[PDB]
Amino acid sequence: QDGEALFKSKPCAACHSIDAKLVGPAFKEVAAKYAGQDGAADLLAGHIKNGSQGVWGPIPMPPNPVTEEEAKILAEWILSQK
Numbered sequence: 001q002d003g004e005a006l007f008k009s010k011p012c013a014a015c016h017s018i019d020a021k022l023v024g025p026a027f028k029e030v031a032a033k034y035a036g037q038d039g040a041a042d043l044l045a046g047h048i049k050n051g052s053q054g055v056w057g058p059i060p061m062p063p064n065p066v067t068e069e070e071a072k073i074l075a076e077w078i079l080s081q082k
């Protein structure tokens with residue numbers, strides 16, 4: 001759950017829904033794509049700070065108040081969302 005925590009303090013929800021979709025890929029659709037995709041959460045974490053674009057919607061995603069460990073955990077949790 002180390003991901004739910006950060007995701008809770010991080011507005012990642014206002015745009016990333018786990019049961020719905022807003023601006024970014026719904027954590028549920030994101031996990032299904034990068035599910036058990038070890039190594040992917042690491043690449044996604046970079047998109048969190050360096051923003052992401054081209055993996056889902058045409059609109060890129062600005063960086064967030066998160067950090068390295070704050071992005072990785074979110075990456076491993078988003079990919080292993082359970």
Ligand code: HEC
Nearest residue numbers: 010012015023024044047052053054055056057061064074
């Ligand atoms: C709306 C302003 C968003 C907020 C707030 C957050 N994210 Fe986001 N994210 C958003 C979009 C539109 C996209 C798709 C970008 C694309 O073109 O593919 C994303 C994507 C991600 C991804 C996936 C990156 C990839 O290359 O696949 C991750 C891992 C991600 N977002 C993480 C993330 C986190 C941790 C957030 C809270 C700090 C967060 N996003 C907020 C839009 C928005």
